[model samples]
Target chain A: ASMRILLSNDDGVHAPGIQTLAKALREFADVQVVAPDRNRSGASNSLTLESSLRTFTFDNGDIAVQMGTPTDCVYLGVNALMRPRPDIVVSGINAGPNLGDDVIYSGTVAAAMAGRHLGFPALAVSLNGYQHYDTAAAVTCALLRGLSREPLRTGRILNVNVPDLPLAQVKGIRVTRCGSRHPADKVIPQEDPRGNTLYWIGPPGDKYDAGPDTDFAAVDEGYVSVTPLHVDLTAASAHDVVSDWLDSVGVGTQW
Target chain B: ASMRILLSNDDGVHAPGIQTLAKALREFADVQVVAPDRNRSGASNSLTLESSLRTFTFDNGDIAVQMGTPTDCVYLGVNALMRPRPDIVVSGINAGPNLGDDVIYSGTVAAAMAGRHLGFPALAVSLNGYQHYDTAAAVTCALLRGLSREPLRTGRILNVNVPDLPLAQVKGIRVTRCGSRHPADKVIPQEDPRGNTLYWIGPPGDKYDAGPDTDFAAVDEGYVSVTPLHVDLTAASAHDVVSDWLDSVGVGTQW
Candidate 1:
C-alpha cells in the first residue's frame, strides 16, 4: 500500500537534519516536506491567528515552506494543502534532545502534537547532543523504516530520542516512560553594559529517574528511547485532590 | 465558603461585557479579573512565545491586565498571579456567540480551555448576537450564580452561549452538544482600486442538527447553551484501528 507522509521540522528549510530525513523518507513513501522557511525552536503546539500565513513552494515541488510556526506547517499541509490527508506526520531529527519536560517547549514535538490533536499518527524524533551528531541520518532512517513496517494508530504520538552514537556502538531501542526533572532550571540574571537586566535560561536540571523503563535512563544507557504519548489533556487522577476547594466549603452541588 | 472566582475574556480589558461579568462575580465571590490589555478576539487556543508578556496591576484592583493573548492572560492569572488557584475560570461575557465549529476559532472558548488545561474548572460565556443585545449582564450573572452552586471537576470546561434576549424573556439553561455548520464561513472576493483581488470573510454559515439538545437550537429557542468540553486530546475509540497496524506488521520488540 502507498503511504502519504508529511515531513516537517522546527529547524527551517535549510537544516541538514530535515534534508537527511526527507531524503530517507522519499525512498519508500510519498513524502511531502512542509516546514518553516526560517528556524522556529521552542514554539510549542501553536497555530498562527494574529498573522496571516504565506507559503513558498519551491520550483521542483520537493519542498513547500511556510512563514509560520512548525504546527502551522503540519496543520495546513495535512488538512488544507495536500489532496488527501497524510497518513503520518514525522517531525525532525532535531539538533538537540527533547526529553523530560523538554517536550513542553519543543517546536518539533509540538508539530507532531498538532497532528495528534487532529487525530493523525505522528512521531517526533531527536538525536541527542550539541556536537551535531553524524549518526542522526542513519538513526532517522532506521526509525522511519521501523515505522513503515509498524505505523502508529490515529490519535497516538511517539517521542523518539536517539543516542548520538553510531549504530555499531549503541544498544537496542527501549520503550520507555517519560522521566521527571529534578531541581529544575536555574534563573541566571545578568546586567548588560548599560545595566539593563537580561536573564539567560540555564541548562535543564538533572533527570529524576534512572530506572530501566524511563526515557532519560534509556538515553543515558546509549539506547534509543521511544515513549508513546496520548493527547488526552485530562490529568483526571489528580482531580479529587485539586478540587479540594469544594470539600473545604463543606457544601455539595445542591443549591 | 468564600469562593475565589477568576474572570477573564478575549474581548480585551475594557470590553463592557467582561466588566459587567466582573462586577456580577463581585456580588458573591472574591473576583479577580485578568484579561488581555488589547483586543484578542478570534485568537484560538494559542499561547504567546515570540513576544514578551508585560502584566500591569490595575488601580481598580478588580483586574490585572496582560499584554498578550487570551490564553496567556488566563494562564498567568491562574497559575501565577491569582491566590490559591481560582476555584473556576469564567471566560467571557463575550459580545457574540460561539457555537458549532465556531468554538474552534473563538478565543473566548480557548481561554476557558486553557484554564481547564491548567487543572482548573472553567466556563466560557458569550451572548449570541452580531449587534449588542439586552440583559447580557443579567443573563451572565444568573449563569454564574447557577454555576457557582455546582462546581465542576478539574479539567472540565463549560462553553455557554446566551441568546440575545432580556433575562425576563429568556428561557432556562439547557445542557447541549456542539452544533455543526454548513461550511462555517464563506469568502467574498473583491477588487481593490489597483485591481488587486481581495477576499472578505463573510458571516458564519448556517448550523446543522438543529435539535433541542444542541447549542444552536438551545440559543435559537431563547435558552442558554451550556456545553461541556474537555482538553483530553485522545480519541480513544480510534485506538483499536491503530493497534491493527502494529499487529499487521507482526514485528516483535527487538529488546
Candidate 2:
C-alpha cells in the first residue's frame, strides 16, 4: 500500500516552507496539505472553540486552509478532511526554529502534538533560519522516509530543527534533550493612536541552558536536532518529593 | 514578609469562580487579579502577538483585565503589572474540571505553567462541576496556604482538580499522574445564517486510561487530584531508542 501523509504547518497553507516540503513528499506518497489560513506562530495548542471554523479547500482536495490554529488544522484533517485516515502526520518546515522552551508555544509543534494525541505517528519540522526552507525540507523528507521503513514506535512527537545550509554542507543528526531559557523579556508598553496604553509581548528570552546535549547546541553546530517531546506532563519521578512535601504541609492523604 | 500572589483565570476576571477565589486568597496574602477580559477556555498557552494588549485596572490595583488569554494575563502580571514580582502564581477555581488529557489545552493549567516557567511556584485549581466554585476555592486556599508554609519547590506546575461538592462533603486530597483519553468525536458540520458551512469541534474524548493512580480516578472518588505537570517534554527514556532507530535507518551520526 502507498503511504498516506498528512502535512500541515503554522505558517499558513501557502507558505513556501510547507509548499516545498509537500512537493518533495508527494514523490514518495500521497500527501495532503491542510493548515491555517493565516500565520499563527504562537498559537501553542489552542483550539477554535468560541467560533465555528471555516475551510477553504481547492479542487482534488490535496490542499485546504482552515481559519483556525495549527492544532485545529490537524484535528480537522484527521477527523474530517482525510478519508480512511492518514498514516502519519507531519507538521511544519516552520519559518523559524522551535528550540529550547520555544516548543511550549510553537504552533508548529502543537500541530504535531495534536497528531500524536490523535494516535498518529507525528513529527514537527522547523528551520533554524527562514532563508533556507530547502534544507529543512530535505531533512524532514529523509526522516519521514526513514520512519516509514523502520517504524519507530513511541508515544512521543519528534521535534526537528534543521540548520539553514545547503543539503551537502549540512552536518549529521543528533538526538538531544530540550534546553531551558531565561525568563522572557519584560512587556513593552507603548501608546496607541487613541493615546491608550498597550503592552506588547516581548521576544523570547535568550538560551540559559544550551549545553552539549541540548537541541540548542545541536543546531548551533549545524547538526539537525531531533528532540522527542512527550505529551503527558506528569512528573512521575517527582511523585515522592511532592507526596512528602504534601505530608510536611499536612495535606498528604487529607487536607 | 507578606506573600504576593498573582491570580488569573480563563473565564475572565469577573467570573464568579475567579472573584470568589480572589476574595478568599486576599485574606491570606496580597493578591492581584489579572486575567482575560472574556471567556478563553481553550486558549491553552497562546500569547497575543498581532496586537498590543490593553488592560483595565482599578484604583487600588488589586484587579485588572487584559484583552487576551490566561497565559497573556500571567505574562503581563508577572513581567509588567506586579511590582517587584509575585511570590506565587495561582490560577483558577475554574468552572469546570481540567483533568487527565484536559491539561494539554486548558488555559487554567497554562496560566500556572507560565508561572512555573517564569520561576515562580504556581498551581491551577478547577472544579469538576460548575455549580460549586466555593468548594474549589476552599481547596485552593488550603493548598496555597499550605504551600506558603512548606514551599514545595519544583519546576513543575500543580494541576489541581477539586470535586464539585460542599467543603464538608469533599473527600481528602490525592497526588496523582495524568491519564489518557480516547479520540475526540467527529467534528459536526452545520450551515450558518450565511448558508456557509462551518465545523464545530466536538467535546473532549471519553476516559481511556483512568486507572487508580490517575487524576481521573482521584477526582472520580471525590478527592482533590493534584497532578504535577512538567514543562520540559523530553522523554529521556526514548532518547536512546531514537538514537538507535536513527542508526538503524542509517542517519545517526551522519546522513
Candidate 3:
C-alpha cells in the first residue's frame, strides 16, 4: 500500500532539514509539504487563534502559510490543504534535538502532536547537533517502515533524535525518556536604543541532569534515541496525594 | 512560613483574571505581578528566542512586557524581576476553561509549567465562562492555602477550572484528567484587501467527548475540576511495545 505522508517542521518550509526529508521520503511515499514560512522554534502546540492565516502556493506545489506556527501548519495542512488528507504525519528532521522536558517548548514535536490529536499516526524526528538531515531522514524512514508493518499503540507519537553521525557510524537505537535541563540558563538583559530595558531568553541550560534511560544520555553516547511521547499530562499518583485536601475542602459538595 | 508569590498570565496584566488572582493571593502572601502587555491566549509554552522583550513598569508597580509569551513572563518574573525569589508561582483565573487535550494549547497552563521548571510550586486556574473571576479566584486561594499546608509532589502543577456559578452556588471540586474535543471546529475563510485568501481558526468543537474522570465532564456537571499535570510526556507502555521493533532493526549495532 502506498502511503500519503504529510511533512512539516519548525525551521520553516525553506529550511534544509524539511526539504531534505521531503525529497527522501518521496522514495517510498506520496508526500505533501506544508510548513510555516518562517522559523517557529519553541512555539509548542500554539494555534494561530488571534488573526487570519494567509497562505501561498509555490510554483513547485509546496505550500507555505504566513504567520503560522508549526502546529498551525499541521492543523491546516491535514484538515484543509491536503487533497485527501494524509495517512501519516511526520514533523522534522529538525535542525536540533528536542530532548527531555524541552519537548514542551518544541514546535517540531508539537506539529506531530497536532497530527496525533487529529487522529493520524505521527512522528517527530530531530538531529542532535549540527546539520545531518540525511541521517535523520533515513532513520525516520526506517522507523516509519517499521511502524507500517507494526502499528504503535493508540495516542502515542515517536519522538526520535538521531545522533550527528553517519548512518553506518551511528550506534544502536535507545528507547528513552525525556530528560531535564538545569533551571533558567541565563536571561540576557539589554537596552533598546530608546534606553528602555529589553530581555532576550538564553539557550538551553549548559548542564543536563539526564538519566541513562533518557534521550539526552542516549544522544550524548552516540545512540539514536526514540522516546514515545503521549498527549496525556495527568499525574495520577499526585492526584491521589492531593485528593484528601480536595475532599477536605468540600470538593464534591452539591452546594 | 511567610511566602513570596509570583503571579503572571497570558491575558495582559490589566485583564481582570490575573488582577483578581493577584489581589486575592495577597491576603496570604506577598504578591509580585508581571504579565504580558497584551492578550496572548493560545501562546502555549513558546519562548521568544529570536528577539528581545521590552518591559514597562506601571505606576502601581505592575510590570508588563511587550512581545512576550506566557512562558516568557514566568521565566523573566521568576529569574529577574522578583526579589528574594518567589516561593510559589500562580497563573490565571483565566477567562475561560482550559479543558481536555485542548489545554496543550493553553497559554494559561503553559505559564504555570514554566514556573514549575523554574523550581517553584505552580498552578494554573480558570473560570469556565464569563464574569466569574471572583469564584475562580476564591477556589484558587483555597487550593493554594491547602497546598501550603501539604505540598504537592515535586514537578507537578494543578490545572484548575471553576464553573461560572457564584461562589455560594458553586458545587464541589473534582479530580479529573484531560479530555478530547472533535477535530477542526471550523475554519473561516476570507479574502484580504490584497485579494489574498486568509483563514481563521474557529472556536472549539461544539460537542465534547468526556468521561466522568475527565476535566470536561467535571466542568459540564457543575463541578470545578482540578487536574494534576506533570511535565513528563513519556509513554512508558508504548516504549515497551516498540522495543521489539527497535531491537529487530539492529539499532545498537556498533558496526
Candidate 4:
C-alpha cells in the first residue's frame, strides 16, 4: 500500500531514532518528515502561541525543521506543509519511554495527539530504554499495518511502548491501560555560577501501584504495550456529582 | 470548611484573577499561593525538565513565586513548598476562557492536572471573556464548597468556565463535555529583523460542531460550564479492534 505517512518526533530533526524509523518506513509507504529543530522532550501539547514559528528544509530536502514544539511541527505539517495531507501521522521511535503518567509531559505523545486533533489516525511509539530503535521500529511497522486494517476512532491514538530487547526475545503485544507513578519532587537547591540560588526539578518518580493491566507492567514483562489513548477527558460519574451540588446551591443567585 | 487549598495559575502570581480567587478562597479555607512568577499562557502539562526553578516570596510572605511553568509551580507546591500536602488544589480564575479544544493548550488546566496527578482533588476555573473575575471567583467558591462535601476521585478534575456577566444575569450551571473547535491553522508568515523567515501560530480556532452538551455551547448560552476531566485516555472499543489485528499479524514472527 502506497500510504502517505507523516513522521515527526520531539528529539529534534537530527535524532537517530527518527532517521532510522523514516528509513525503515520508506520501504512500505511514502514518508515525509517534519520535526522540531531542537530537543523538546518535556513539551506537552504546547504550541508556540506568542512567538512566531520558523521552518527550514534540511537533510537534502528529506526533512523539514521547525523552530517550534512537537505539536507545532505536526500541526503545521498536517495543515500547511504535507501536500494532499497524510493518511496517518507517526510520532517517535522516541529515545525514552512515554509510559503511564509521563505521557502528560511527553512531546512524543503530544505530537501524535496533534495529528489526532486534526482528524488523522496517529501512533506514538517509544523504546522502554535507550538504544533499541530497531525493536521499536519493527513493532511500529507491524502495528501500523494492523491499524491500517482497523483505524482508530477520532480523538484516539495508539501509544506503543516496546521493551528494549531484540525482536526475537520480545514477547507478544498486549493491549493495556496507562499506569500511575509516584510524584518525585527532588528539587536540587544550589547556587548558580553568579551565587544566585537555583533549583532543578528532578527526574520522573519511581513506579508504584502499577497493575498487571497497565502499560508499565506490560513493558516490564518484555511485551509490547499498546494503550489506546483519547482526548475526551470527561468523567461521567462526576457530572451527576457536580450536578447534585449545583442543584442544592443555585448558581445564578447571590450567596 | 477550613480546608487546605493550594492556589496557582498560568497567568502569573500577581494576576488579578488569581488575586481575586485567593482572597475569595480565604473566606472558606486557609489558602496558600504558589504560582508561576511570570505569565505562562498556552503552556500545557509541560515541566521545566532541563532548567532549574527559582522561587521568590511576596505579599507579606503569603505568596511563593516560581520561575517555572504552571505545572512546575503546582508540582513544587504539592511536594515541597506547602508545609503539609494540600487537601485540594485550585488553579486559575484564568483571565480568558479555556473552552473546547483549546483546553489541550491551557496552562490553567495543566496546573490543576498536576495536582490531580499527585492524589488531590483539583479545579480549574476560567472567565469567558476578560474581566468579571468576580463572577468566576464566586462560582469557584460555591463549587469548592460543594466539592468539599463530595470530593472528586483521583485523576479527575473540575474544569469550570463562567460567563463574563453579573451574578444575577448568570444562567444556571450545566454539566458538559469538552467540544471540538474548528482547526484553523492561521499561520502568519513574515521576516524577522535579521531577514529570517518566521511564522506566527495564531490564537485558538473558531468554534464549530459545538453542540448544546458541550462546554463551548454551555458558556455561549450564558451558563457556567462544569466539565469533569480525567487523565485516563484508554479507549475500550479500540482495545478489541487493535487486538484482533495484532492477533492476525503476529508481531514477534517475521511476516
Best by TM-score: 2
RMSD of 4: 2.8
List per-model TM-scores for chain B.
0.83, 0.93, 0.91, 0.91
lDDT, candidate 3, A84-119, per-residue tens: 878878999899889988898899999998777544
* Clashing residue pairs found in predicted model 4: A53-B199
lDDT of 3 by residue, B47-163 (tens): 888888888888888877888888898888888888888787899979988888778788999889887754446889989986989989888887776766665653368899999
DockQ values, each candidate: 0.15, 0.69, 0.60, 0.53
What fraction of the true interface contacts does model 4 reproduce?
0.60
- Candidate lDDT scores, in order, read 0.66, 0.84, 0.82, 0.80
lDDT computed for candidate 2? 0.84
Q: Tens-digit lDDT track for model 2 on A53-168?
A: 88887664645656688889988888888887888899988988999977889899999988885444588999988888888877888887787678786546899999988877
Tens-digit per-residue lDDT, A11-73, candidate 1: 876677787777777877788887887766746555564444556767646455455678677
Off by over 4 Å in 2: A58-66, A117-120, A252-255, B58-66, B117-120, B252-255
The best-first sequence of candidates by TM-score reads 2, 3, 4, 1
Q: Count the backbone clashes (under 3 Å) in each candidate.
A: 4, 0, 8, 1
- Candidate 4 lDDT, tens digit per residue, B170-206? 8878889889766666667789899987777665677
Considering just the first chain, candidate 4 attains a TM-score of: 0.91
Highest-DockQ candidate: 2
Candidate 4: global Cα-lDDT? 0.80
